[PDB]
Design a protein around this nucleic acid. Structure first.
Lengths: 93, 80, 96, 104, 104, 93, 80, 96
DNA sequence: TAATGCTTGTGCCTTTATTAAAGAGGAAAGTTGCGGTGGATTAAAGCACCATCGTGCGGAGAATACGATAAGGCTCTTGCTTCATTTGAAGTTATTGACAGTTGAATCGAGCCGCTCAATTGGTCAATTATGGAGTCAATAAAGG
DNA sequence: CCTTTATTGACTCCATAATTGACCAATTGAGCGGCTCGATTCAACTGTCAATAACTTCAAATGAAGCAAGAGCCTTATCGTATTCTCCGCACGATGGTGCTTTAATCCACCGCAACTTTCCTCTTTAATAAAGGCACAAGCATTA
């Protein structure tokens, strides 16, 4: 059975930030677990936000509010800025 | 609004310490206790306001405060 | 004249305020403080009264628990007077 | 066929994240831009952690990131340390710190 | 028509709990006995807390349960105190305790 | 709008335990919040259990395991005993 | 199996204290540190076993331990 | 003869063990301890090796954090020697 | 300061194993079309939150006399550290076998979906009884003699 | 111990408001049928975990000896406490105004469903070079003089 992991995409991101630095298998597993954990946190917060407001759908606004609730401070600011940029790029195309 | 943190008077902090079982209180506690309190509120109100901003409302309800508290492991019964 | 020794009326106050369930902070100064703090996150905010009451009760519970931890830390150092370093140690161990 | 990640200018799998969001049943319906927003946020967090870890690895004169470097990057950063305060990194060790009183 | 709560010998609303479980979308499908188990557990917990609170109220020579009695019952019990350790009871106060060092 | 609470059923339970003792409105709200919180905890744990085992349905077994995970010690034992009794009574009828 | 708690030797506890920044260690620590450790394990293994009992399995996997740890606010990366 | 004063090799060990990432408890005694503890919850249990490794790493992380808190408590009472009361106070403030 | 043991940091050969690179396939993402359900807009009631004014009185602020508590200094004695020797138990390697986890199929049980409807529960209003406000007395405890 | 004084709890009378009881509707739980999926059982394959044996050598146990750190005792001085006077702004009651929250209707717009395609991401296999093991070695440090 093929297992879904971010080990591909994470590696891509690494080659965009540090082209000459590799990553070990243990560190790759730790990074994959980190991505999974943050995904679950954001998704659960978005679900709670949708349920509190009696909304059946999760939009980018729910994700933005979940990012503000979960990530601290400047991390949340930069993440919101990147998410808004990506959504604008996706919609404009 | 300014200086409102000074509205948390020394007797109020002393009463809160008495409820905590404190027999003797140093002179500089009242300052520290204020700052600590401020931090706590800034951690809750922010979250509460966030909820108020998501519901597209302008009034902060007791539900917003209860959810903001529960988000931090400070579940509060009696206002649900 | 009749003078109580130090720490007797303090013990009486400990017994009196641990038995009551009332709020210990004045309502109007706390309401002003909450509005001041919230004005830095979003201007022109209105507060439902029960929201401010819930905030006050949560803050008072937090401070009472913190003072219990502070008293434990003070007694650890062979003292009865709580000091700012005791609050700092309690908040550090608590993870704050 | 233009992939949604390429459309949004991301390296992360917008489609796979859409599948994960739908499979998790977080809501009855999923908006069009919610997976894109989530992919952007996850990409940014991964980039930040990897930048800090690569800097830590370079400071140690190593060309490979190991769990020790990830832990050093996490603990030496205020906001990442706040986000991952209650997280244990396997084979990560601890931040080297000795109290001033214990020093001679 | 025999109500499900009466069929299970309970006082709690098995049907309403079924509706709450389905509305929350905790799973795609819901078993027949899951709401019954839910109602039984909730009824038992309510009965336990109310027994302890009523005993506390009787000890105080009161015939009505107030939040103070609920807090006393919760904090004077090991299991309930462990379950509700991180919970604040409104208008409940604190458990009366003074450290032995502070006494004269 | 009609607000839905447990304030009826809890009262019934009280009259079964302490026939001569009433309950105030504030205590009523506190007990209702307590019941809602425990319901949410057990339901979320059951959902996590079903998701972990790739099961689409929540059965009484998921609820029993969630009760064991959430309630501590003798509380969990007695709650499991009550739930099993109720399920047996419901099935036998 | 009995007495296996004594397999956590005094040098192991001393090394754990050294990694924690401890300079001097009292004699009775090694006993207390054992009991504390035992309690911790009993809180995790139980939960882990519970998961193993729900999946109708007889073998405790790393997933069971990871979930049991996450249930207690002790999230652990590297075994996911 | 050459002898180090007390607390010097202790500081060197602090620096050495805070730099390494290895496990500090022996694997086989810990495995026996885990099997002993689990035998009281369900007889005839089998343990996957990575499960025991995860348990060991979690337990070691918990003990190291507890010892950091204990060292803070010991420093608070104007001491350098950690004592059982320090562990008890740290676990009390932590909520254990 | 200074000589000297001493442990840790630094430079180089080895190898290896742990990561970089590549392929077949198959599982999953992108596309297209439909149609229905949900979000966005607008208007209106009413209600709820802010601001005003008055007062009067209980709580806060400041000063005073002071005792007792925290902090520093001293001493000692014992408990923990450092080091050396002996051993005994963990660690690694190779092997066996049997248990148990996983995958694949059939199938019978069981829960979703629609629609009716009637039985249970919630909003609204009157009301009495447990509880608070206030006054008075009796028991308890603290402080000086 | 005694004696005086301040505090608090019990006891009762009166107000009071707060919980209990009763009624109308509303809305949702129970019933019944059809149907498709799922979870239960069975079986085989296959992964791996418990157990064995052996050998080794490194870390644990134990003791000696040493030293310095915790703990008890004493002294002091200063600073939090109890009390009183005075002051001041919190709180309760009544009222206006308005804005903003909720509800309902409407329209449009966008997302789930279903099937086809096509492409990219993941086991399996092979390579190669970064780093641990080991050896040699320099140097910053601690220790006693």
């Amino acid at each position: 059975k093929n297992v879904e992991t971010y080990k591909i995409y994470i590696f891509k991101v690494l080659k965009q930030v540090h082209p000459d630095i590799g990553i070990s298998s243990k560190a790759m597993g730790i990074m994959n677990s980190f991505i999974n954990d943050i995904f679950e946190k954001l998704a659960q917060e978005s679900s709670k936000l949708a349920r509190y407001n009696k909304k059946p759908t999760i939009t980018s606004r729910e994700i933005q509010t979940a990012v503000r609730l979960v990530l601290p401070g400047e991390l949340a600011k930069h993440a919101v800025s990147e998410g808004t940029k990506a959504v604008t790029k996706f919609t404009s195309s | 609004l300014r200086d409102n943190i000074q509205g948390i008077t020394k007797p109020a902090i002393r009463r809160l310490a008495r409820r905590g079982g404190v027999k003797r209180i140093s002179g500089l506690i009242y300052e520290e206790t204020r700052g600590v309190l401020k931090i706590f509120l800034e951690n809750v109100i922010r979250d509460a306001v966030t909820y108020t901003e998501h519901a597209r409302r302008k009034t902060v309800t007791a539900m917003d405060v209860v959810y903001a508290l529960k988000r931090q492991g400070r579940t509060l019964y009696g206002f649900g | 004249p009749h003078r109580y020794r130090p720490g007797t009326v303090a013990l009486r106050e400990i017994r009196k305020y641990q038995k009551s369930t009332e709020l210990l902070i004045r309502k109007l100064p706390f309401q002003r403080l909450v509005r001041e703090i919230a004005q830095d996150f979003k201007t022109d905010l209105r507060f439902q009264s029960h929201a401010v009451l819930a905030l006050q009760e949560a803050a008072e519970a937090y401070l009472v628990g913190l003072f219990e931890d502070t008293n434990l830390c003070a007694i650890h150092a062979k003292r009865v007077t709580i000091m700012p370093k005791d609050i700092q140690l309690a908040r550090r161990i608590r993870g704050e | 066929s233009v992939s949604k990640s390429m459309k949004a200018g991301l390296q992360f799998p917008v489609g796979r994240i859409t599948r994960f969001l739908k499979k998790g049943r977080y809501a009855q319906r999923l908006g069009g831009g919610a997976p894109v927003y989530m992919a952007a946020v996850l990409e940014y967090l991964a980039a930040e952690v990897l930048e800090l870890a690569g800097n830590a690895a370079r400071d140690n004169k190593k060309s490979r990131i190991i769990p020790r470097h990830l832990l050093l990057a996490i603990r030496n950063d205020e906001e990442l340390g706040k986000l991952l305060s209650g997280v244990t990194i396997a084979h990560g060790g601890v931040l080297p710190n000795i109290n001033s009183v214990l020093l001679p």
